[PDB]
Amino acid sequence: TIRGIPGIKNANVVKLMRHRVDAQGKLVRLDNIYAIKTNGTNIFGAMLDDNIDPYTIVSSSIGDTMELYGIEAARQKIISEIRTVMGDKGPNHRHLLMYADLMTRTGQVTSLEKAGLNAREPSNVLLRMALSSPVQVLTDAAVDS
């Protein structure tokens, strides 16, 4: 690496649409705000750089948010990612809350795959048997008593 934050493939200036509070207390919505949007997530390098606000770093990757920030920030990032994937006519927010709270209930982001079901409900042999590969999980339950 010669220059720039590693893992930042690109960086483009995008105007943002943001709310601010005036001295009279009005909640004015500002469109003149400028910030950059990158490709590739390296939150750590962004915090290191001084031209970039370290406390207002937003990353599309759940993993980097989990590692850098924690599990509550990872849960909020899961909600945000599922929401932006949903589109315009998305579901209610409580369903996304349920999705995110299920994965992040163990202090780690657990998937919806069979690995995540093992992590969240290891003792529920019958549930994992119903999900996939009943013979393998049946063998594991038998040997594990």
Next chain:
Amino acid sequence: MAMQKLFTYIYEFIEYRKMVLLEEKVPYDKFVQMVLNTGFFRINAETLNHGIVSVFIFGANGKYVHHGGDMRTLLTNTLNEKKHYEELILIVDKPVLSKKNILDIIVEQRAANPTIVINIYPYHLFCINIPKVSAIPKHKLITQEEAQEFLGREYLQPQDLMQISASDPPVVWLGGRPGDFVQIERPSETAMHAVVIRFITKSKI
């Protein structure tokens, strides 16, 4: 430039932990050259419990993060110092966490010294004011009695609550030991902020 950020935010973290310093604060230059030559910058903190907490900011590629003999020597000789030594903290580079032998010496000295708690953290935990990050909601540690009252009202054993690792950055800044409870005020698009209580489990290796 993680050295300067780490240098300022470790002292901000000591202040956040409501601890006082036992010595005088050197500037950036002395800190970085001492880290580069010695291999570690040692910072002593005293808590309200009248315990002593020591922090070791290891170098990125120094002599101490590569060989287990020297690291073992440091732990053995520093842990026999007659301070109260409530907690020891090692701040090391990110790739060091995968290096096994350092984790082995850490766990070996943890088992050898029961009452002392040793944790090794990467750089990115102390390169920013973690409680001041927008994306991180407000964590606070509820005492054992109020957590027990909450559980008894809820008919919940502690293992029923959602778990949070003791290595979580907000919990690390708060100073959450495993087995304790942390109350969180998370913003909500539905109910306009809500409170959850999470159980602190054992940290990552």
Next chain:
Amino acid sequence: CKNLPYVFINNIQERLQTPIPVYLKRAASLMRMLIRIELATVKTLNIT
């Protein structure tokens, strides 16, 4: 508005005025805010 979090428990704990858990108080914060906004004294002058 003070007794609003008691819709999450029952009328009995409302009569007994037993303590409300913190998260129950937080859950009804939005409804409390809306009720305060819409039942403000400047808006209920004609309501007996």
Next chain:
Amino acid sequence: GYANRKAIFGLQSCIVDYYRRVSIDTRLVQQLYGEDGLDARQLETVRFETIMLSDQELEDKFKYTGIQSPLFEEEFSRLKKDRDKYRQIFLNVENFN
């Protein structure tokens, strides 16, 4: 179908208990269902008037001046506090999105 079956088997065990917490067996998943405990079928969208009002506009509209009791000073301060809390929380939500 693939994604839906995987998700269903991930989430199917989450059942609202007698505390309106969402729990797997006995282990909590949520302190409250939607963090408000409300059914998704019983929600209506309503505007919160005080959010965008300036401080003088808020005083013009919601401050009651027909009685000199300090109870109405307290009530208006409560309205202002609620507006400020809403602005703060949702500005933070806007910040990390």
Next chain:
Amino acid sequence: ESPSICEGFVQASSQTLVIIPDNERITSNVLTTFEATRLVAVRAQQLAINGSTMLKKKYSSPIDIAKQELFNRKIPLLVMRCIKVTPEGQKIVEIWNPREMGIPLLD
């Protein structure tokens, strides 16, 4: 060795029903639609098998009679809600009364 039974404490220890006092219950005093529906269904099946009722207005189907018994607060059932399974073999319930409790929409 052993056929998974000799050491098998398969018989679970009998539980004792602990009923939370009427001033200590912290569940809703309004019947959830599930609970009201279950009450109506149980009562209507029991009227089908037996036929007795406390109603004054005579109806031609047990469903209507059970629905009115729930509405007119004469259904002879008690919704018991269980919140624990303690390791000490002590099942913690709170027995609610559908006659005292509120009734959901159901219509």
